[PDB]
Amino acid sequence: AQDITTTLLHPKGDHVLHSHAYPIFQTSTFCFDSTQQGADLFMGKGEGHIYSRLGNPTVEQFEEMVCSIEGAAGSAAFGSGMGAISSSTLAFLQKGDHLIAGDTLYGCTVSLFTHWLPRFGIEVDLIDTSDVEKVKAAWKPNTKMVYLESPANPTCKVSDIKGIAVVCHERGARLVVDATFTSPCFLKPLELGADIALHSVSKYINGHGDVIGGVSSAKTAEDIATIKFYRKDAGSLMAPMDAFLCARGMKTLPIRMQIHMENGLKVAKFLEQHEKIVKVNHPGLESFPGHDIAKKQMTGYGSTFLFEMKSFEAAKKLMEHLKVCTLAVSLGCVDTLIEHPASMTHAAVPENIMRKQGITPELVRISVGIENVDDIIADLKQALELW
Amino acid sequence: AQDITTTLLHPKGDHVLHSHAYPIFQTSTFCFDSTQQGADLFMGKGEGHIYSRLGNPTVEQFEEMVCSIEGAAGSAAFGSGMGAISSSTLAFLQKGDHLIAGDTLYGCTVSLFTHWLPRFGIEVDLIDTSDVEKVKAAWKPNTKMVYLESPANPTCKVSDIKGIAVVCHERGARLVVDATFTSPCFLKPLELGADIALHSVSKYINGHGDVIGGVSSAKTAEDIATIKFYRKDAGSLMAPMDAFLCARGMKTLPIRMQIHMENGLKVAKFLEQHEKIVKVNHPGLESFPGHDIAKKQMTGYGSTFLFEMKSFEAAKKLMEHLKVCTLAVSLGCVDTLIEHPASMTHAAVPENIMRKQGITPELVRISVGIENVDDIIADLKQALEL
Amino acid sequence: DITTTLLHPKGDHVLHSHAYPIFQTSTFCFDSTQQGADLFMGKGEGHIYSRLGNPTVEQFEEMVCSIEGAAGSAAFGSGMGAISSSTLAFLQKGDHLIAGDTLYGCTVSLFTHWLPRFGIEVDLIDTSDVEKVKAAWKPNTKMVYLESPANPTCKVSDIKGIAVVCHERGARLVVDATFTSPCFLKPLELGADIALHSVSKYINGHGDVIGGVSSAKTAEDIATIKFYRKDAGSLMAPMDAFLCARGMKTLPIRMQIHMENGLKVAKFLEQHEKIVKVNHPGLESFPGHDIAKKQMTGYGSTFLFEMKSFEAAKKLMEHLKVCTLAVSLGCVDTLIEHPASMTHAAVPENIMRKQGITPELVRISVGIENVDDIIADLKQALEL
Amino acid sequence: AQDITTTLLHPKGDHVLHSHAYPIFQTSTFCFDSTQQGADLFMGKGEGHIYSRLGNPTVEQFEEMVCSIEGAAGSAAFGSGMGAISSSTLAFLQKGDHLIAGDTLYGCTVSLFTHWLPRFGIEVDLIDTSDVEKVKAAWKPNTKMVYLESPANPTCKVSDIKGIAVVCHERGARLVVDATFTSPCFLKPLELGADIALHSVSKYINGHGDVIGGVSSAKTAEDIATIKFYRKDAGSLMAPMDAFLCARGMKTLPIRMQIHMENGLKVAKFLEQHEKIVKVNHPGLESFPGHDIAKKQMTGYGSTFLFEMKSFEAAKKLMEHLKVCTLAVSLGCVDTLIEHPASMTHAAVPENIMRKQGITPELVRISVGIENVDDIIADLKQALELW
Ligand SMILES: CSCC[C@H](/N=C/c1c(COP(=O)(O)O)cnc(C)c1O)C(=O)O
Ligand SMILES: CSCC[C@H](/N=C/c1c(COP(=O)(O)O)cnc(C)c1O)C(=O)O
Ligand SMILES: CSCC[C@H](/N=C/c1c(COP(=O)(O)O)cnc(C)c1O)C(=O)O
Ligand code: MET
């Protein structure tokens, strides 16, 4: 079969005015041929565009590319990953519905789930999804959705997607997986039984750290139509320029991910053997609890992972004396990022959830870029071996 | 004090590397000097940036421009006017609360209020808000908000914002006003007593028809923080490039609006005197019901208005034989747009609500651009006399 | 209005898009070998490569082509890209060029340093006197280059008068109309052969893109220009072309307020005690007013004025709250500059005096702010 | 020694408002603090900006990146490769000066050298530069410059850059090398004795087929100042937006070139063993004349090469029946391009020069992208094996 590198470099669809690169449709509205042709496009009949919020050609191009790696019925682009998460949950969940979600999630996902959803009459439970039995125990007659991050931000906690999918399929609950950390190159949730696969495009998919974006993919046509229906009213849209950049960045995704995976594994192997390091939470290491599920359900690993220092001051010493790694939040960028979860990405997370995640000031999160691995390792080495 | 033209041309803020034009900050994340400096910003102390979703310098520049015209404590930019509307309502409204909204609104605003809000346990009533005592009768103990469009899409129906604001202040409810149609140049809702003033930037504020965006401005610092706290999780953001283009477009807004207003008035008066036109729904016309309310509360008028034809076939012939006007949805663009509400912008609106709005197959909506008035009038004259 | 023409340009919509798409592409696809071969030979419609032609860029070119009344227009990466392409495409070894003594700094740099390196004889003379153009004439004179009103002194030249001399003696007339814009100055309708602009200024008007455009009277001349651009390589970027076309949408409207603002400012400065001389082509005091009044349908907002001393000029320029100390002109906001030590600092010491540039001269570019706000900003700086 | 992947991902210079990605300075002019501060910057004193034509921060960031791989004193970015070629030649050559240039050059370079330079009183001779003795024989007392393309567009003809450099150094002539076909990753002319190394950034460096651009680098500070002095007058500038994209595209240059090189070699080796193909002109093959010079003087190979079919109609049949490869001009793009030199890129070159270059209607130029090589080979295979 045709390789994914070829698939991404050759998206389906006609060229516009014979242009090799797909044009940036920096426009708000579209022109109608006639009143009937305009009336029909609102009804759903005929091919063409109306208004960029409903559909934009360069945006739709990016959606097609994502839809093609995911193996979905359709994809929806968003202004942010949080736009994707809101439109993948609130498009389906309503007053009286129950949501089971992982206890270890991205900071703002926790914020959306614990603060905003309960205000909308939606029952939410944060559950350890590494254990399928805990997921079964939390299940209720009104359970409509299970939301998973695996490997989780930032602890790399592994969940049994395949096993949970079964329970979701038997009981009529929609399974949504956030696969941001791994990318659609190595994790394809819809193959594992999930109903909706989503990403923060801001991270690996774009990879260049210059755009905030989100994407959501559905196994079903009805489900993607509902997501786009919600997006129409909620209004989280990917800009034409941002879509152009994301598609462009995605052109090199497979090879970037290959280097990410290998760099990340080598950095983690180096850290785990280092005197100053207590523990390394990389899902590709044999020492890691959820390794056997991760290697079975994914075809590779992302390069973002967590590790434990002997103290906060030691962690502070490492982070502030690096010359290649740059101290900043976010991840999945071409260059290596480094961050302190306890006081940055997960400072807003309540300590009730903080303890069980479980994030301590000794922890450092690293997102290994595509720089020569030896340069990255040497940079960490000299910082770890300071006076 | 500076004039509106000068204020928008010289926005408050520092120059970046002595750059005359403000740089497009096409970035996702930002760097930290130290752990403490990064940890501080998340709290947040005191000056600096973290991540574009939380704050982007180019986006913030546009936000401050809108804040200066509205007379607000702060403004938040969005990826769409719908992003602004959702964030201006769902940030405050929760399960068990009650919203009163105008019966005539933009199509997707009707879609948002009728479909999605009741799913979140929010009570919504669509009420004729041109009558103030009708809002008082629709009131409940759990009423937390009133939402208004004045002039409303597409009928140009006018609401007494100042009068409704008094009711909202006395009874503990917020007043949110969609001022897309008139722009902040002519309509400043926060001066009329409203709590939140929002726009579809995609329309007049940008004015060049090349970007989708929204903005919301709050009277109090607490409300705008809550709005931005919602945007943080909801995720409707304005792209750095779009922020650059919106700010750029807003540079000529005052002079564009002045021409929009004058053009829209002459075109409406031309249509009113024409024998093939039943009625023209322009808020600046003496004949229009609620003209006096619009005259006192607004300093000018938008260029988007509705009018009635003899039949559907007559409307069809007009829209399909224009050479200058472009048949397309949207409004507030530099060139002239024309649209059919019944089967386009307000086609997804439930036929129950479409009846109360007064939207018929004979009605045509025009958005008069900044072309020469005589070119637009002549284009209409040619199409009408076939 | 010209506005209607600019808002509704010639051409077909792309996938029904209201705004013309940004063709951020390098190359284009072919249906077959024959179709691709044909386009390289000029047969059929379509595109090959962005340097040869870009749809977004061509859309801007056609907007300029309409207002200028040209056979064709070519966009460039800079005004200097337009200037050098409008001269070095025609001038060759052994040719002679007569150019105005007062030109933009880098246009002087081009003509004085680079042009004579290519075997092109260049003389800079006073083109405000038409009889002086006749005296500078040589048997090998192939081109006259003009700039009216000139940067920065606003020195007006009789374009139609010089055009007659050029036509009779077989020479091209190139006019830099940056200072006035195609709204008010249309050189091709005064008998000029080539009309060019620094789009960076009024045409774009938003001070966020560098670009140039050149419009030719004949189809052969623009083909020569585009043939030169193909090899020289000064191209307008697709994004920049998008921004320039977008900026052009408000051009006539911006120029109306530019003209009126610049006039009221100059009239204020002329009656002010601290100002010796004001060089605005719209003022009746200005020497070349009669020529400018008849040849142009309006005036730009960039002009020059004389202070008592350099210290007084420094005091004025460094205390403005609204106006900005910056080079460039034709922006929506008001810019201020000092020619002797900035724009015309590189201009040779002998051409410096022929132009009449002194350390006392201050150049202002009046934007589209409220007239009273800019006048008040100048008023407080000239007194406090 | 720090690897080039790391170098390109971590360019020197300060971050702007703590922004991770370098901002797009979409501006015309810059503000001054005082009259003297503005006067000094024109005089050359102080830091740093005045007007985008003289210097744009975004553009200078890209120039910095190119300067870093090249090992130059400075770099200048342009609106096109032809902008770079003109400014590297016409910035130094005046009437009475003599230029020696390769006989096999890019189409428009031939146009510039044949049509425009002679009009400026500059003597030009197109010479076979694969033979050092022919370069020596063509030499004159007024010879000021030698311009080389190696491997040449499109025949891939190899020139002895090192050997020609010596002659240039001994006789006081600048050596200028166009290294577009190979990229700075594999060919660094300044290490070989060239004075100026230039690229069409439109090709490999940007790599994404969305930007037209050029860059020129000099060994000497005076020379790059002269090039920039010409640029401000001639007017070929890189747009801030284009600069942003080129820097972005350059982030992944080393890894893209790794795949280009290996893909290109595998495609060439497949074509050479195929019965329909008469000859393959890839500089990395042992059969190719000048392979020994190429493998010594370069660190790798580009993926653009030319091959001979049995007929024009056979060439037509191949080019017009590909499903992955796209029929278009240009090269060095992320996806595979294909064109016909005799009727396309080199249809404008005079017949006396085209016969000298060896371009016949049987020839096909392929620019191998970063698609899975087996997919590329399979696409060519089915097109070659048609009924
Ligand atoms: C069907 S689609 C179309 C659209 C538009 N609008 C629109 C609007 C909106 C939205 O906005 P976006 O930005 O989101 O679009 C809001 N509001 C208001 C008042 C309005 O009118 C029209 O109507 O035409
Ligand atoms: C030294 S730098 C400076 C710049 C500006 N210029 C301007 C100009 C130009 C330039 O152009 P670009 O676009 O190339 O820049 C040209 N021409 C003309 C006539 C003019 O005034 C000024 O002057 O300020
Ligand atoms: C005819 S059109 C086509 C184009 C391309 N070129 C390319 C090139 C150039 C150009 O460059 P730009 O950027 O200007 O395009 C230069 N050089 C070199 C070496 C090369 O290969 C090809 O060939 O394909
Ligand atoms: C808490 S806002 C910044 C978080 C960032 N996107 C991360 O996951 O690293």
The full 3-state SS of C92-132, as one line of letters, equals CCCCEEEEECCCCHHHHHHHHHHHHHHCCEEEEECCCCHHH
Taking CB atoms and an 8 Å limit, are B84 and A235 in contact across chains? yes
**SS3 of residue D21 by DSSP:** coil
CA dist B118 to A94, A227, B82, D386, Å? 9, 18, 17, 62
Neighbours of C372 (CB within 10 A): 13
Residue with tokens 């940067």: C151
Quick one: angle between helices A253-272 and A373-384, nearest 10? 30
Rounded to an integer, what distance in angstroms lies between the CA atom of residue A236 and that of residue A238? Answer: 7
Inform me whether the C-beta atom of residue B79 falls under 8 Å from chain A C-beta atoms: yes
Query: In CATH, what number does A254-387 get?
Result: 3.90.1150.10
Nearest to residue B96, comparing CAs of B142, B137, B145?
Answer: B142
Quote the distance between the C-alpha of residue A307 and its chain's center: 21
Given A20, A27, A244, which is nearest C17 (Cβ)?
A27
Put simply, whether C30 touches A (Cβ < 8 Å) is yes
User: What is the number of the ligand 4 atom nearest to the C-alpha of A348?
Assistant: 1
CB pairs under 8 A, 24+ apart, for A59-65? Answer: A59/A25, A59/A237, A59/A238, A59/A240, A59/A243, A61/A11, A61/A13, A61/A22, A61/A243, A61/A247, A62/A215, A62/A238, A62/A243, A62/A246, A62/A247, A62/A250, A63/A215, A64/A11, A64/A12, A64/A13, A65/A8, A65/A11, A65/A247, A65/A250
Q: Chains with 3 or more CB pairs closer than 8 angstroms to B? A: A, C, D
**What whole-number distance in Å separates Cα of residue A366 and Cα of residue A340?**
9
Identify whether D151 is preceded by a cis peptide bond (ω within 30 of 0).
Answer: yes
For C144, the enclosing helix (H) or strand (E) is strand C141-147
Fill in the amino acid letter for B254: P
Which backbone phi and psi does A175 adopt, to 5 degrees?
-105, 120
Method by which the model was determined: X-ray
Residues of C in contact with B330 (CB under 8 A): 18
Taking phi first (over 0 means left), then psi (-120 to 50 degrees means alpha), and beta for anything else, what does residue A330 get? left
Tokens coding A44: 């759903």
- Residue type present at position D150: S
Which residue type occupies D127? I
CA D53 to chain B, closest CA, distance in angstroms equals 13
What six digits make up the tokens of B342? 């019944």
Q: Which two tokens stand for residue A359?
A: 């994030």
Name the one residue in this structure whose structure tokens are 């009650």: B98
Three-state SS at B41? helix
Up-side HSE of residue D305: CA atoms within 13 Å toward CB?
A: 26
Q: Name the residue type at position D106.
A: Y
Instruction: Kindly list the catalytic residues of B.
Output: 53, 106, 178, 203
Helix (H, G, I), strand (E, B) or coil at C79: helix
CB pairs C-D closer than 8 Å: 228
Rg of the Cα atoms in chain A: 21
Q: Among the bound ligands, name the one nearest to the CA of residue D206.
A: 3
d(CA A309, CA A280) in angstroms, rounded, equals: 9
Q: Give the integer Cα–Cα distance in Å for C7 and D301.
A: 50
HEC per residue, B71-113: CCCEEEEECCHHHHHHHHHCCCCCCCCEEEEECCCCHHHHHHH
Residue B128, judged by CB atoms within 10 A of its CB (0-12, 13-18, 19+), counts as middle
User: CB neighbours (10 Å) of residue C9?
Assistant: 16
Asked if residues A56 and A240 have their Cβ atoms less than 8 Å apart, the reply is yes
C96 has a chain B CB within 8 A of its CB: no
Q: List the one residue out of C212, C229, C222 whose CA is nearest residue C106.
A: C212
Q: Residue D87: which residues within 8 A CB-CB, separation 6 or more?
A: D76, D78, D216, D227, D230, D231, D234, D236
Task: Please write down the long-range contacts of B297-300, taking CB distance under 8 Å and 24 or more positions apart.
Answer: B297/B160, B297/B161, B297/B162, B297/B187, B297/B192, B298/B182, B298/B186, B298/B187, B299/B185, B299/B186, B299/B187, B300/B182, B300/B185, B300/B186, B300/B257, B300/B258, B300/B261
Strands in chain B per DSSP E: 74-78, 98-102, 123-127, 143-149, 174-178, 196-200, 214-218, 277-281, 304-309, 326-327, 337-339, 363-367
Report residue A324: phi and psi, to 5°: -100, -55
Cβ atoms of D123 and D155 closer than 8 Å = no
Give backbone dihedrals phi and psi of A105, rounded to 5 degrees, phi first. Answer: -130, 170
Burial of C8 (0-12, 13-18, 19+ CB in 10 A): middle
Q: How far apart are CA C239 and CA B51, in angstroms?
A: 26
With beta carbons less than 8 A apart as the criterion, state whether D28 and C210 touch: yes
Q: Phi/psi of residue C194, each to 5°?
A: -130, 135
With beta carbons less than 8 A apart as the criterion, state whether A129 and A118 touch: no
Q: What is the best residue among C106, C329, C362 to mutate for testing ligand 2's pocket, by most ligand atoms within 8 Å of CB? A: C106
Between the CA of A241 and the centroid of ligand 3 the distance, in Å, is 26
Closest B-chain CA to A341 = B39
Pocket of ligand 3 (CB under 6 A): C 49, 51, 233; D 80-82, 106-107, 109, 149, 153, 178, 180-181, 200, 202, 212, 214, 329-331, 345
Count of alpha carbons within 13 angstroms of residue B195, beta-carbon side: 24
Q: How many CB atoms lie within 10 A of CB B4?
A: 17
- Pairing between β-strand B363-367 and β-strand B337-339 as defined by DSSP bridges: antiparallel
Cα angle C188, C53, C244 (rounded to 5 degrees) comes to 60
Residue C5 to residue D254: CA distance in whole angstroms:
49
DSSP bridge pairs for B198: B178, B216
B192-220 burial string, b = 16+ CB within 10 Å, else e?
bbbbbbbbbbbbbbbbbbbbbbbbbbbbe
In Å, the largest CA–CA distance within chain D is 77
Cα-trace Rg, chain C: 21
Longest Cα–Cα distance in chain B: 74
d(Cα D198, Cα D75) in Å, to the nearest integer? 9
Compute the distance between CA of residue D289 and CA of residue D156 in angstroms, rounded to an integer: 10
Answer yes or no: is the C-beta of B152 below 6 A from any ligand 1 atom: no
Q: Is C201 a catalytic residue?
A: yes
Give whole-number Cα distances, A262 to A154, A371, D320, in Å. Answer: 19, 11, 39
Question: Which residues of chain C lie closer than 8 angstroms to D235, CB-CB?
Answer: 76-85, 212, 234
Residue B30: closest CA among D372, A210, D155: A210
**In angstroms, what separates the C-alpha of B47 from chain D's closest C-alpha?**
11
Interacting residues of A223 by C-beta distance below 8 A, sequence separation 6+: A73, A174, A195, A196
Q: Cβ distance C310 to C360 under 8 Å?
A: yes
Per-residue tokens: A77: 């682009």
Instruction: Write out the two tokens for D259.
Output: 């795949």
- Which chain A residues touch D2 with a CB distance below 8 Å? 372, 375
Q: How many whole angstroms separate alpha carbon C307 and alpha carbon B106?
A: 58
Domain B254-386 CATH class label: alpha beta
| Burial class (CB within 10 angstroms; exposed 0-12, middle 13-18, buried 19+) of D278 | middle
What is the rounded CA–CA span in Å between residue D324 and residue D11? Answer: 35
Nearest residue to D264 (alpha-carbon basis) of D292, D301, D309, D293: D301
Kindly report whether the peptide bond that precedes residue C79 is cis, defined as omega within 30 degrees of 0. Answer: no
Sheet holding D143-149, edge to edge: D74-78, D214-218, D196-200, D174-178, D143-149, D98-102, D123-127
Of residues C95, C101, C158, C176, which has the active-site annotation? C176
Q: Do domains C1-251 and C252-384 have the same CATH topology?
A: no
Mutate to test the interface with C, among A15, A18, A37 (most CBs of C within 10 A): A18
CATH 3.90.1150.10 is right for the domain spanning C252-384: yes
Q: Which of A97, A103, A178, A379 is catalytic?
A: A178
Burial of C139 (0-12, 13-18, 19+ CB in 10 A): exposed
Q: Is A346 on the interface with D (CB under 8 A)?
A: no
Beta bridge partners of B248: none
Of C4, B359, C355, C85, the C-alpha closest to D233 is C85
Q: Which fold has domain C1-251?
A: Aspartate Aminotransferase; domain 2 (3.40.640)
Instruction: Tell me the ligand closest to D365's alpha carbon.
Output: 3
Kindly provide the resolution of this structure in angstroms, with one decimal.
Answer: 2.6
**D197 interfacial to chain A (CB closer than 8 Å):** no
Residue D268 contacts C, CB cutoff 8 Å = no
Strands A304-309 and B98-102: unpaired
Residue type, B138: A
> DSSP per residue over C278-321, as a string?
EE-TTSSSSTTHHHHHHH-SS--SEEEEEES-HHHHHHHHTS-S
Q: Active-site residue A45, yes or no?
A: no
Residue A59 contacts residue A211 (beta carbons within 8 Å): no
| Contact yes or no for B26 and D27 at CB 8 A | no
Domain boundaries, chain C: 1-251, 252-384
What lies within 8 Å, CB to CB, of C260 at 6+ separation is C371
Asked if C13 has any chain A CB less than 8 Å from its own CB, the reply is yes
Q: How many CB atoms lie within 10 A of CB C138?
A: 11
Helix (H) or strand (E) holding D281: strand D277-281
Q: What is the largest CA-CA distance in chain C?
A: 73
Residues of C in contact with B334 (CB under 8 A): 7, 249-250
Cα–Cα distance for residue pair B345/A47, rounded to 1 Å: 18
Helical packing angle, B221-234 and A81-89, nearest 10°:
80
Instruction: Count CB-CB contacts under 10 A for residue C116.
Output: 14
Q: Do A282 and A288 meet the contact criterion of CB atoms below 8 Å apart?
A: yes
B353-367: buried (b, 16+ CB within 10 Å) or exposed (e) per residue?
bbeebebeebbbbbb
D28 touches chain B (CB under 8 A): yes
Residue range A2-253, CATH number: 3.40.640.10
CB contact under 8 A, B5 and C324: no
- CA A364, CA A268: separation in Å to the nearest integer? 12
Ligand with an atom nearest the CA of residue D338? 3
User: Quick one: CA torsion of B5, B11, B15, B21, rounded to 10 degrees?
Assistant: -40
Helix H or strand E encompassing C324: strand C324-325
Residue A346 has, within 13 A of its CA and on its CB side, a CA count of: 29
Task: List B19's β-bridge partners, or say none.
Answer: D30
Instruction: Give the best residue of C208, C374, C375, C377 to mutate against chain B (max B CB count within 10 A).
Output: C208
Spell out the SS3 assignment of chain A.
CCCHHHHHHCCCCCCCCCECCCCECCCCEECCCCHHHHHHHHHCCCCCCCECCCCCHHHHHHHHHHHHHHCCCEEEEECCHHHHHHHHHCCCCCCCCEEEEECCCCHHHHHHHHHHHHHCCCEEEEECCCCHHHHHHCCCCCEEEEEEECCCCCCCCCCCHHHHHHHHHHHCCEEEEECCCCCCCCCCHHHCCCCEEEEECCCCCCCCCCCCCEEEEECCHHHHHHHHHHHHHHCCCCCHHHHHHHHHHHCCHHHHHHHHHHHHHHHHHHHHCCCCEEEEECCCCCCCCCHHHHHHHCCCCCCEEEEEECCHHHHHHHHCCCCCCEEECCCCCCCCEEECCCCCCCCCCCHHHHCCCCCCCCEEEEECCCCCHHHHHHHHHHHHCCC
How far does the centroid of ligand 3 lie from the alpha carbon of residue D137, in Å?
29
Instruction: Kindly state the helix (H) or strand (E) to which residue B291 belongs, with its residue range.
Output: helix B291-297
Tokens of residue A157, six digits? 């906690």
Measure the CA–CA gap between B264 and B252, rounded to whole angstroms: 18
Q: For the sheet containing B277-281, what is the strand order? A: B277-281, B304-309, B363-367, B337-339, B326-327
Task: Quote the tokens at residue A318.
Answer: 């490492």
Does C28 sit within 8 Å of A20, measured CB to CB?
yes
Instruction: Tell me which of C80, C85, C104 to substitute to probe ligand 2's pocket, judged by most ligand atoms within 8 Å of the beta carbon.
Output: C104
Cβ distance D369 to A251 less than 8 Å, yes or no, reads: no
d(CA C249, CA A347): 48
What are the helix (H) ranges across D10-54?
A: 35-43
Ligand 4 centroid to Cα of residue A63, in Å, is 23
Q: Is D280 helix (H, G, I), strand (E, B) or coil?
A: strand
CB spacing of B79 vs A237 below 8 angstroms:
yes
Say which amino acid occupies D188.
Answer: K
Please say whether the beta carbons of A261 and A254 come within 8 A.
no
- The amino acid at residue D44 is G
Cα separation, A35 vs B320, whole angstroms: 7
CA distance A364 to chain B (A): 11
Active site members of D: 53, 106, 178, 203
Contact C251, C364 (CB under 8 A): no
Residue A330 Cβ < 6 Å to ligand 4: yes
> How is C41-72 classified by DSSP, letter by letter?
HT-SS--SBTTT--HHHHHHHHHHHHHHT-SE
> What are the distances in angstroms from CA B173 to CA B82, B119, B140?
22, 21, 11
Give the residue on D whose Cα is nearest the Cα of B21: D27
Element (H, E) at C276: strand C275-279
Q: How many CB atoms lie within 10 A of CB C315?
A: 16
Q: Structure tokens of A21?
A: 């690169």
